[PDB]
Design a protein around this ligand. Structure first.
Ligand SMILES: CC/C=C\C/C=C\C/C=C\C/C=C\C/C=C\C/C=C\CCC(=O)O
Length: 259
């Protein structure tokens, strides 16, 4: 009994999933397959101590690792940015609002997808070839040992929803196209787009998780969690700025944070 109205939403869902697969080299599906011994050819090298770290590379630890994450983030911003362009209506919006939606949405999206590469013990690195334990990270020199812990806590709770890539594709689209962003010139156009995006997600979740009662509301509530993650990460950098005057925060990343 898929009426003609709902039929339009499915088409949107498929389009986004398609652009999602095409913009992100390491999907949750692949991540899970690596993480759960579902292989012998895609198993990762593990880093849990200083020795394994150096035995893993095939300037100091804490700093070297931080610069690393910096490189990746910027790469992610680039991937998320290319995904944005595929969202119907996004490029058609005011150029300025396009920049605002990205600057405010990029990190909320990065933490959402990061969960895909995490389990309670650690996180995949280098496109899945490596796996760095939570303990190792939670032990790095202060205050770097506090950088990852908050994301892990999100991940663990967030992964309980058991969402797959097709679900995520729409969710992250909903995140970007949010009219309540600071400095938006024309909120209306943006809200019209989020409206059917939320309509797409709801059907998507409905059909794909017929048993999960109120999955739509549970997922939307998680959006609060992402926000706090961003908030405290920000003041964390402010500290790193002061304590490490010789460390360089990538310009692209520095531009996103003037908010
Ligand atoms: C361990 C670093 C070395 C290589 C990186 C390879 C893959 C990266 C994947 C996971 C690494 C762990 C965290 C990085 C993920 C997101 C960035 C973390 C915080 C955001 C920092 C920011 O953008 O300000």
């Amino acid at each position: 009994a898929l009426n003609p109205e709902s039929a339009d939403l499915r088409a949107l869902a498929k389009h986004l999933y398609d652009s999602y697969i095409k913009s992100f080299p390491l999907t949750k599906a692949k991540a899970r397959a690596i993480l759960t011994g579902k292989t012998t050819d895609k198993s990762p090298f593990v880093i849990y101590d200083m020795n394994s770290l150096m035995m893993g590379e095939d300037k100091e630890v804490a700093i070297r690792i931080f610069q690393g994450c910096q490189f990746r983030s910027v790469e992610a911003v680039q991937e998320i940015t290319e995904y944005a362009k595929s969202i119907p209506g996004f490029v058609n919006l005011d150029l300025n609002d396009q920049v605002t939606l990205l600057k405010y949405g990029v990190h909320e999206i990065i933490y959402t997808m990061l969960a895909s590469l995490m389990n309670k013990d650690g996180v995949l690195i280098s496109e899945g070839q490596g796996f760095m334990t939570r303990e190792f990270l939670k032990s790095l020199r202060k205050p770097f040992g506090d950088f990852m812990e908050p994301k892990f806590e999100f991940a663990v709770k967030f992964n309980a929803l058991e969402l797959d890539d097709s679900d995520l594709a729409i969710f992250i689209a909903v995140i970007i196209l949010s009219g309540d962003r600071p400095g938006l010139l024309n909120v209306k156009p943006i809200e019209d787009i989020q409206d059917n995006l939320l309509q797409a997600l709801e059907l998507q979740l409905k059909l794909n998780h017929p048993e999960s009662s109120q999955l739509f509301a549970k997922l939307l509530q998680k959006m609060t969690d992402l926000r706090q993650i961003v908030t405290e990460h920000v003041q964390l950098l402010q500290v790193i700025k002061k304590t490490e005057t010789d460390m360089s925060l990538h310009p692209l990343l520095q531009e996103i944070y003037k908010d």
